[PDB]
Amino acid sequence: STRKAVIGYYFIPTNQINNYTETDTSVVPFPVSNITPAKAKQLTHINFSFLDINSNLECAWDPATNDAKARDVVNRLTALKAHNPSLRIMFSIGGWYYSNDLGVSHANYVNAVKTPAARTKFAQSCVRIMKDYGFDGVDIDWEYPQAAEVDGFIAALQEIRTLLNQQTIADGRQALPYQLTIAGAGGAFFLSRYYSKLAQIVAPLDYINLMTYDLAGPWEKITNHQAALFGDAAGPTFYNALREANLGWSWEELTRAFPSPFSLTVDAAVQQHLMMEGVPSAKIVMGVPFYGRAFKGVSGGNGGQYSSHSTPGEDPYPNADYWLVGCDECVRDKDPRIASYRQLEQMLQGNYGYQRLWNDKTKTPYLYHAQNGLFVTYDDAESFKYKAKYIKQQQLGGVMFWHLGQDNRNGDLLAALDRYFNAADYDDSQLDMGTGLRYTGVGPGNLPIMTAPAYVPGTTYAQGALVSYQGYVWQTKWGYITSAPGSDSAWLKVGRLA
Numbered sequence: 001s002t003r004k005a006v007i008g009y010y011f012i013p014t015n016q017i018n019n020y021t022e023t024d025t026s027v028v029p030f031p032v033s034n035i036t037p038a039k040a041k042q043l044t045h046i047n048f049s050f051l052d053i054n055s056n057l058e059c060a061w062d063p064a065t066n067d068a069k070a071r072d073v074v075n076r077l078t079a080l081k082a083h084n085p086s087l088r089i090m091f092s093i094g095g096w097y098y099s100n101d102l103g104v105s106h107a108n109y110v111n112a113v114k115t116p117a118a119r120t121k122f123a124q125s126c127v128r129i130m131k132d133y134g135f136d137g138v139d140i141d142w143e144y145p146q147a148a149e150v151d152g153f154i155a156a157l158q159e160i161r162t163l164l165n166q167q168t169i170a171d172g173r174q175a176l177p178y179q180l181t182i183a184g185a186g187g188a189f190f191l192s193r194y195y196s197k198l199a200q201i202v203a204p205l206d207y208i209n210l211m212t213y214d215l216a217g218p219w220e221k222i223t224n225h226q227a228a229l230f231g232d233a234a235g236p237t238f239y240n241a242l243r244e245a246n247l248g249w250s251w252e253e254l255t256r257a258f259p260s261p262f263s264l265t266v267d268a269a270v271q272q273h274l275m276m277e278g279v280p281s282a283k284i285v286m287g288v289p290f291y292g293r294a295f296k297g298v299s300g301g302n303g304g305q306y307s308s309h310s311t312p313g314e315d316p317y318p319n320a321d322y323w324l325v326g327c328d329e330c331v332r333d334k335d336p337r338i339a340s341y342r343q344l345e346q347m348l349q350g351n352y353g354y355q356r357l358w359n360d361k362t363k364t365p366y367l368y369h370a371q372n373g374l375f376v377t378y379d380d381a382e383s384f385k386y387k388a389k390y391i392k393q394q395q396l397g398g399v400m401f402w403h404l405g406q407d408n409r410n411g412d413l414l415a416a417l418d419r420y421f422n423a424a425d426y427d428d429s430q431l432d433m434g435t436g437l438r439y440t441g442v443g444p445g446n447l448p449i450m451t452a453p454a455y456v457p458g459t460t461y462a463q464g465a466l467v468s469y470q471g472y473v474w475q476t477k478w479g480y481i482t483s484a485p486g487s488d489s490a491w492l493k494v495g496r497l498a
């Protein structure tokens with residue numbers, strides 16, 4: 001029954017706020033008025049982005065922001081709620097630019113969560129901003145707290161939660177209670193910063209919106225799909241950093257949960273969350289990108305997949321060679337490395353030399369430009385069928401995407417997601433999910449259902465024997481074992497009784 005969340009980022013830069021207008025797309029390419037009533041019904045959340053944490057360690061707009069124009073923009077978004085009583089306008093604190101390890105505001109994030117009093121002041125500023133501008137909830141997109149910061153971050157979220165709950169009571173908003181989300185890591189290297197404390201991070205949240213995209217990029221040496229649903233054995237694999245997380249698990253426990261190397265996929269990130277105890281599937285939201293990543297200097301043979309390449313990683317783009325043929329938005333933005341889905345349709349449709357190819361293991365499309373040696377990894381309405389099917393099958397909370405301004409003009413990507421979850425006449429019972437590589441890790445949070453003969457005292461069990469005892473199915477790690485399962489280190493808990 002429960003409606004899947006559909007969570008769309010709305011991003012607008014400070015200069016566009018300060019010059020806001022709905023009638024000149026050279027000033028504001030994606031005004032609020034582009035979010036029509038029909039789009040509004042298809043969304044459950046819009047994440048307005050981005051606010052920041054200032055040096056006073058409070059949530060704040062960019063100080064260069066014209067406040068009356070900011071209100072007017074936010075008012076336009078909340079007016080959308082008139083077409084859809086389920087819809088929320090969240091706001092988002094952070095983003096890569098403000099909050100990455102080398103970001104301009106980074107130290108503010110670290111300091112805002114550092115002490116009890118700092119957290120109280122920060123938490124209060126969050127709810128005060130929410131109430132003053134008319135937002136429906138708080139999203140945190142710190143990319144990413146690390147190590148020593150994680151306990152502070154967790155405490156900050158717990159405190160925001162309580163303050164949100166007070167506010168919900170004060171405004172009688174039990175029908176649409178104020179909510180708390182974060183944008184979570186969607187790959188294991190960044191996820192490993194807070195993985196051991198994942199249950200604590202998720203507990204105060206309504207959702208954790210996994211950034212299961214940007215899993216490939218110019219910083220990797222080999223081209224790859226940025227959001228492969230499942231793995232391709234011909235593609236690159238990666239060290240599983242999670243096996244070095246401070247978990248206190250045994251060798252066998254670590255090995256069964258964290259195969260290494262592994263395929264960096266959407267399914268991997270999702271399963272890595274489900275493996276942890278106290279992380280419920282309904283709180284897990286799959287991120288998807290409404291943009292492609294482009295690579296140049298690729299050699300042929302497999303459509304530009306898994307190729308070396310010559311794409312600069314530096315920021316800003318180091319020159320004016322805008323080599324993404326047909327991408328007009330790339331010229332406007334002076335960077336050929338990322339193109340909106342909206343632009344990609346146009347590139348494919350014009351005579352620009354791209355073929356649209358399909359990897360049936362990853363269930364994702366890609367563009368290949370054979371003449372110039374270009375490769376583009378992106379998602380479309382077809383890749384979203386498989387992802388939506390996976391969302392229903394794994395009982396996830398829904399879908400998130402970055403970002404709304406990158407859909408095509410008729411918003412076909414958002415309409416597709418809405419249809420795959422909610423349309424009466426859409427049927428995916430026969431959609432084939434393929435033979436791509438699944439992440440097979442098992443941990444305490446996702447033990448499969450199993451049967452086996454009851455454990456018998458006095459019996460000598462060989463290596464690999466399976467018994468049932470006190471709620472679970474257990475496996476001997478070596479032989480010959482006669483101890484009761486769970487009473488020493490010889491037995492591995494591998495499954496649970498119906």
Ligand SMILES: C#CCO[C@@H]1[C@@H](C)[C@H](OC(=O)NCCNC(=N)NC(=O)NC)[C@@H](C)C(=O)O[C@H](CC)[C@@](C)(O)[C@@H]2OC(C)(C)O[C@H]([C@@H]2C)[C@H](C)C[C@@]1(C)O
Binds near residue numbers: 013
């Ligand atoms: C959370 C995020 C991603 O931030 C984007 C920026 C940071 C954008 O990052 C992405 O779009 N990344 C895709 C993955 N998404 C995320 N990391 N996070 C995310 O989805 N959060 C929900 C990168 C590719 C970018 O365009 O950076 C340019 C220079 C390369 C940068 C940093 O100058 C910049 O340039 C513009 C295009 C003018 O945007 C601004 C920012 C100054 C804004 C502030 C950043 C933004 C929104 O474009």
Ligand SMILES: [Cl-]
Binds near residue numbers: 175176177
């Ligand atoms: Cl609700």
